[PDB]
Amino acid sequence: SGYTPDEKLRLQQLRELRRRWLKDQELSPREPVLPP
Amino acid sequence: KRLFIIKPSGFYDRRFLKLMRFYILLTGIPVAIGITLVNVFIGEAELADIPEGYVPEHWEYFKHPISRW
Numbered sequence: 001s002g003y004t005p006d007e008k009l010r011l012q013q014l015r016e017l018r019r020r021w022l023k024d025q026e027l028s029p030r031e032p033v034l035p036p
Numbered sequence: 037k038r039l040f041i042i043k044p045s046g047f048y049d050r051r052f053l054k055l056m057r058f059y060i061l062l063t064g065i066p067v068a069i070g071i072t073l074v075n076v077f078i079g080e081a082e083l084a085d086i087p088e089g090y091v092p093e094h095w096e097y098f099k100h101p102i103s104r105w
């Protein structure tokens with residue numbers, strides 16, 4: 001029943017990576033640098 | 037919070053549309069203004085009888101000035 005050790009470890013690693021990617025999809029306070 | 041929106045590039049379609057509009061208008065605004073000026077100042081001809089012994093030219097059988105020219 002449940003995950004295997006490798007399954008859980010890989011889900012944890014993929015989770016950390018995915019959350020970093022989603023965090024870095026955010027815009028900085030200046031991003032839409034519109035030209036005049 | 038403001039996220040980044042992943043879209044395909046819209047630069048090239050937009051540039052194409054601007055270029056097409058530009059060239060179409062570049063030559064078609066003068067034509068519209070010219071047709072208006074002709075219609076207002078020149079106008080169409082009025083139907084009249086063929087005077088005695090007179091023979092009209094082939095273009096004098098049409099009423100619109102642009103068609104006549």
Ligand SMILES: CCCCCCCCCCCCCCCCCC(=O)OC[C@H](COP(=O)([O-])OCC(O)COP(=O)([O-])OC[C@@H](COC(=O)CCCCCCCCCCCCCCCCC)OC(=O)CCCCCCCCCCCCCCCCC)OC(=O)CCCCCCCCCCCCCCCCC
Binds near residue numbers: 064075076079080100
């Ligand atoms: C676009 C960019 C992206 C690309 C898109 C794709 C584009 C591709 C385009 C490809 C190129 C195409 C080229 C084709 C060229 C064709 C030209 C042509 O065939 O001309 C025909 C025709 C030419 O006329 P004509 O037959 O030679 O003249 C006959 C008469 O002798 C004339 O009569 P007249 O001399 O007595 O009239 C006076 C004169 C002028 O009239 C006036 O000055 C007065 C008008 C009345 C005004 C009265 C009120 C105003 C004043 C009031 C306020 C001031 C006074 C009061 C002030 C004090 C108040 C107290 O009339 C005109 O000049 C009309 C204007 C003509 C313009 C023609 C333009 C053609 C352009 C060709 C190139 C295309 C370029 C496209 C871009 C161009 C820019 C748009 O022009 C028209 O057809 C105009 C159409 C008018 C339609 C009227 C409305 C009818 C609507 C009914 C149907 C809709 C009902 C609802 C439908 C369903 C809805 C649900």
